[PDB]
Scaffold this motif. Structure first.
Motif, PDB file in Angstrom:
ATOM      1  N   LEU A  92      56.826   4.885  58.289  1.00  0.00           N
ATOM      2  CA  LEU A  92      58.030   5.683  58.275  1.00  0.00           C
ATOM      3  C   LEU A  92      59.155   5.042  59.064  1.00  0.00           C
ATOM      4  N   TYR A  93      60.366   5.440  58.705  1.00  0.00           N
ATOM      5  CA  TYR A  93      61.582   4.791  59.141  1.00  0.00           C
ATOM      6  C   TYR A  93      62.704   5.805  59.101  1.00  0.00           C
ATOM      7  N   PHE A  94      63.702   5.559  59.925  1.00  0.00           N
ATOM      8  CA  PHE A  94      64.901   6.361  59.966  1.00  0.00           C
ATOM      9  C   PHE A  94      66.023   5.680  59.196  1.00  0.00           C
ATOM     10  N   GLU A  95      67.103   6.419  59.000  1.00  0.00           N
ATOM     11  CA  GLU A  95      68.270   5.864  58.343  1.00  0.00           C
ATOM     12  C   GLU A  95      69.025   4.883  59.219  1.00  0.00           C
ATOM     13  N   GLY A 115      71.011  14.366  65.940  1.00  0.00           N
ATOM     14  CA  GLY A 115      70.123  13.717  65.020  1.00  0.00           C
ATOM     15  C   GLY A 115      68.680  13.835  65.440  1.00  0.00           C
ATOM     16  N   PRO A 116      67.782  13.317  64.614  1.00  0.00           N
ATOM     17  CA  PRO A 116      66.360  13.454  64.902  1.00  0.00           C
ATOM     18  C   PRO A 116      65.868  12.391  65.862  1.00  0.00           C
ATOM     19  N   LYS A 119      58.640  11.479  67.699  1.00  0.00           N
ATOM     20  CA  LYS A 119      57.773  12.146  68.654  1.00  0.00           C
ATOM     21  C   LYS A 119      57.150  11.169  69.632  1.00  0.00           C
ATOM     22  N   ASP A 123      57.472  12.304  73.369  1.00  0.00           N
ATOM     23  CA  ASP A 123      56.291  12.466  74.192  1.00  0.00           C
ATOM     24  C   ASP A 123      56.281  11.548  75.398  1.00  0.00           C
ATOM     25  N   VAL A 134      65.539  18.385  67.179  1.00  0.00           N
ATOM     26  CA  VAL A 134      64.643  18.120  66.063  1.00  0.00           C
ATOM     27  C   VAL A 134      63.812  16.902  66.424  1.00  0.00           C
ATOM     28  N   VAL A 136      61.315  14.118  64.513  1.00  0.00           N
ATOM     29  CA  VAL A 136      60.984  13.605  63.190  1.00  0.00           C
ATOM     30  C   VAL A 136      61.584  14.503  62.123  1.00  0.00           C
TER      31      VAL A 136
END
Lengths: 136, 67, 386
Positions: A92-95, A115-116, A119, A123, A134, A136
């Motif tokens: 997974l990856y972000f924009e 923005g997101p 985790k 953490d 938010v 993820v």
RNA sequence: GCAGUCAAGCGUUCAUAGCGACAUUGCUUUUUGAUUCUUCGAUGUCGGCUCUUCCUAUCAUACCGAAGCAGAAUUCGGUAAGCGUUGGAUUGUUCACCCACUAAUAGGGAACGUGAGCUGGGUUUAGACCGUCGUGAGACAGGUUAGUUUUACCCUACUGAUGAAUGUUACCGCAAUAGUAAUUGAACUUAGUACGAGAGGAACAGUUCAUUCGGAUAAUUGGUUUUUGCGGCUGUCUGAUCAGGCAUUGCCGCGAAGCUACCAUCCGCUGGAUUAUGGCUGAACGCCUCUAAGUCAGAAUCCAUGCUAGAACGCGGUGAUUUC
RNA sequence: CUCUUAAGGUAGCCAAAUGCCUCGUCAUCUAAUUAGUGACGCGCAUGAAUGGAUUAACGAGAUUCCCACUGUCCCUAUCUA
RNA sequence: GUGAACAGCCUCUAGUUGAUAGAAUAAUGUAGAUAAGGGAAGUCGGCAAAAUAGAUCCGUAACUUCGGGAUAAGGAUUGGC
């Protein structure tokens, strides 16, 4: 990983070598952050220090407030744009690539995160999670 | 363990297979493959891609037995 | 003068010479230390690398962030038809080494090992072990003489076994013979076990079990004559170079006026013998058992074989071992699976794994389905099937 | 440049914890000189890039001893070169200076390693400019700008690859010799514990991870893409249609297989002998003493275990061994 | 004030392609700049058709920074002839 | 024919079908390309390559010898029927 950081971090792929401009997600006044160094990986000939989600970097500010510009400060990477595998098996990856300005102990100069946030960072840094809406 | 659905195509995503794209809106998109991921980045419409669940639903193709 | 930036050594020198192996079947250069109190058992086995797949299972590692949480570890499948015993071998200790004194064979050897003894089977009269099968001839007088020699002498004892390649889907027809050490008390008991098991078969269920760490011994995939850059990991020289950049620049100093053994040159990459250790077993499965790929959590009757078969190998119709991770050798290669030499106690070992799901979707593409029933349900009726 | 002896004095008191004047003994050949032995029928004379090895006068890491060592940090010293010693701004630079990370950013050698290995920024041909000098032609370890980097197919070495012969052929093996590899850190807990007036503030065991390195493998993710596999697009040609050609792999999207990425995943062993040092018993020295006889423990050390190759003149076991 | 010259360097300009000392000093540009720019100037040895100072446009001239862009690089991998 | 075009691309007339060949697809090359994320950290130096690119419409600064700068910059649109 990181001084003032609660816990350890599993490796995740590096996206942000030294020299790299990522957006800023905090309300500190800054707009971008120029990664100049990384607290962590030490040394290899002709290897650039690179950062991932959750890493604490040394950064400057190129665009933003004058009272933040022209001085190096710590920062925390909250978005990567480079795919990484979780142990659960989803790449997974972000924009985008995104960070927040911090102090060496992990606290935040800002109070909000737009923005997101991953985790992993949330953490490993509790003061980020506090100011993170938010995840993820 | 859970089986997710491709946002673009509607295909089942078994574990260790596919990608996940988190957008600045914090909307999460799931892909079984680089095909659907690339068509998404190209900003194509699943309702107009013919091999997609949305297309087949919108055109009333094959299902014919649930509603 | 000195290097100017102290960097480390490219490559490992204890894996030299990076030459071609003598055979596809790698040598077992060591067996576990014998304990002359346990029962009599084999220390290793022979199988064929079939391929890879994906595994879900819940982690039982306390202190880890992901304890009691799922992971997607990868596994190699090694198809492992029952290994059949055709011989007995005795080694006695000398100040020059362990030396084979004599070796006893079975009465009836199959047309696979008889095949191994030839390079042209279609032309031959197939005369091998005929006078030996005639040496048996009433009771095995000379045979019991040789077994008694082994009992009297023979510090260690090794059993000659071979594979059921015909049960394997390969096109080879010629079985792989190997010596496997026996571990257990009383070389007498060892050789009596062997004599009892002559002509008889031995399955992985007796040799390996769940959660056992093993070593894998195989011949690495070959890649031919390779350049220094991919063979050793040397930095490419810049774009501006005359006469190549995919090279090592300084091939040694003036003095010693020689090229040293330790500088990176070009040559053979792959087809080396490699022994990779501490790969955990995740499944010991049985071709007798339908639903090899099923699980307590899944409960769908399916073999481990993916849709369309294992690519370049085939289907799995025999027993098999699903071993964690990546194992040397490419598909169809004979792998020798050895029991660990030292007792590991790390909590990565001793961790009883319980699988949760097995990927049996096609590896000949981006497989979306695990069963044709799933496919038929998702797609519906087609122009075919109609 | 590095290291010793001596010991006046410093260090609250106290020569020697750590320093150490006046003097003095030496090693080194990474400085610069001195020399002119070799080379002027030419040994390609800066620096960097690349790669390997070596040394140790040890920066870090392992184990220790000493302190003006309570703890924490620091300092001195020893055995030790096993392993590691970075990323960048400015400069052609060696050197230097700053930023930052780091366990640490130690020094050096190998024709001041390394140009038929690169580069060619500098220096040091010819063009041109300036300043000073010179009547001038012209000079300047002064500045500036531009300025052909040739040859390996030979022997050796190295890396890989075959191979005659040793009755033939085949299978299974042994093992000499050679090589060898793993490294470092953080967090949690131990514990706001010990120690300390307080400020402050550990460590052994254990757990989880990570750094550098290495060996493999390709389930997945990513890349690649003449599958010229499917589709689409442009111009032109085949009267149109269908289906195709050309556009030096025409272009775009997807793209299996294979190759491959700290851009992906898996894995990376256990014992013994020792150094330093600390000790035992115990004399010399009718006490004392780790030492003289003898002996215990003990380091990232050494040797094995393990891992790689296998002697093509090192071995063994076994099979079959050719008449029409 | 004094010595002295044929005259004693004018207007202007500068660590400049001219400044040894020198990586000059101050500012700016950078996280950090022996680079660059702007200023300062008893200037080893600037300077007026041996032309001075400046200059729009032009430049395969030398040079610094910014944006965009990229396998230059991190760090290499793959394909074709 | 396309097209602003004696450009490039394809074709008719006319002329060639010549340049040692065959088999394979190792390394290293020559020539051509593509690359996640970053983006000049590379190098003396962005060398090389990428990016831009035609036309229509809009919009265009400093400075200036008033002539230019200027395709400044920077944006939109473009097919077929």
């Amino acid at each position: 990983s990181g001084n003032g950081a609660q816990g350890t971090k599993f490796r995740i792929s590096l996206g942000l070598p030294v020299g790299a401009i990522m957006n800023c997600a905090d309300n500190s006044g800054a707009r971008n952050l120029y990664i100049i160094a990384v607290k962590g990986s030490g040394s290899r000939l002709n290897r650039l220090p690179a950062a991932s989600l959750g890493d604490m970097v040394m950064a400057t500010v190129k665009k933003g407030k004058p009272e933040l510009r022209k001085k190096v400060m710590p920062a925390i990477v909250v978005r990567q744009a480079k795919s990484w595998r979780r142990r659960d098996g989803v790449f997974l990856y972000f924009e985008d690539n995104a960070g927040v300005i911090a102090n060496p102990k992990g606290e935040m100069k800002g109070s909000a995160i737009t923005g997101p946030v991953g985790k992993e960072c949330a953490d490993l840094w509790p003061r980020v999670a506090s100011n993170s809406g938010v995840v993820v | 363990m859970k089986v997710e659905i491709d946002s673009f195509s509607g295909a089942k995503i078994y574990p260790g297979r596919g990608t996940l794209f988190v957008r600045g809106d914090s909307k999460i998109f799931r892909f079984q493959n680089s095909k659907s991921a690339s068509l998404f980045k190209q900003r194509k419409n699943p309702r107009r891609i013919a091999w997609t669940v949305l297309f087949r639903k919108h055109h009333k193709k094959g299902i014919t037995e649930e509603v | 003068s000195h290097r100017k930036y102290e960097a480390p050594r490219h490559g490992h020198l204890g894996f030299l010479p990076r030459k071609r192996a003598a055979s596809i079947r790698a040598r077992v250069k060591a067996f576990p230390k014998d304990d002359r109190s346990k029962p009599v058992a084999l220390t290793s086995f022979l199988g064929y690398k079939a391929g890879m797949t994906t595994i879900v299972r819940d982690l039982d590692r306390p202190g880890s962030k992901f304890h009691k949480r799922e992971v997607v570890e990868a596994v190699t499948v090694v198809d492992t038809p029952p290994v059949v015993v055709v011989g007995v071998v005795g080694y006695v200790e000398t100040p020059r080494g362990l030396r084979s004194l004599t070796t006893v064979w079975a009465e009836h050897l199959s047309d696979e090992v008889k095949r191994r003894f030839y390079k042209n089977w279609y032309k031959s009269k197939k005369k091998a072990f005929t006078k030996y099968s005639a040496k048996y001839a009433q009771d095995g007088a000379g045979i019991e003489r040789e077994l008694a020699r082994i009992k009297k002498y023979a510090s260690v004892v090794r059993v000659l076994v071979h594979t059921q390649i015909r049960k394997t889907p390969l096109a080879q027809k010629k079985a792989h013979l190997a010596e496997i050490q026996l571990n257990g008390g009383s070389i007498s008991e060892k050789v009596d076990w062997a004599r009892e098991h002559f002509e008889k078969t031995v399955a992985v269920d007796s040799v390996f079990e769940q959660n056992e760490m093993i070593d894998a011994i195989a011949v690495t995939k070959g890649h031919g004559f390779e350049g220094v850059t991919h063979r050793w990991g040397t930095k490419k020289l810049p774009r501006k170079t005359h006469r190549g950049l995919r090279k090592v620049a300084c091939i040694g100093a003036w003095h010693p006026a020689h090229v040293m053994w330790s500088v990176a040159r070009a040559g053979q990459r792959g087809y080396h013998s490699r022994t990779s250790i501490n790969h955990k077993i995740y499944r010991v499965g049985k071709g007798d058992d339908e639903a090899n790929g099923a699980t307590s959590f899944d409960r769908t009757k399916k073999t481990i074989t993916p849709m369309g078969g294992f690519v370049h190998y085939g289907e799995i119709k025999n027993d098999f071992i699903m071993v964690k991770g990546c194992i040397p050798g490419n598909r169809k290669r004979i792998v020798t699976l050895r029991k660990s030499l030292y007792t590991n106690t790390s909590r990565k070992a001793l961790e009883e794994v319980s699988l949760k799901w097995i990927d049996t979707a096609s590896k000949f593409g981006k497989g979306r389905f695990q069963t044709p029933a799933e496919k038929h349900a998702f797609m519906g009726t087609l122009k075919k099937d109609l």
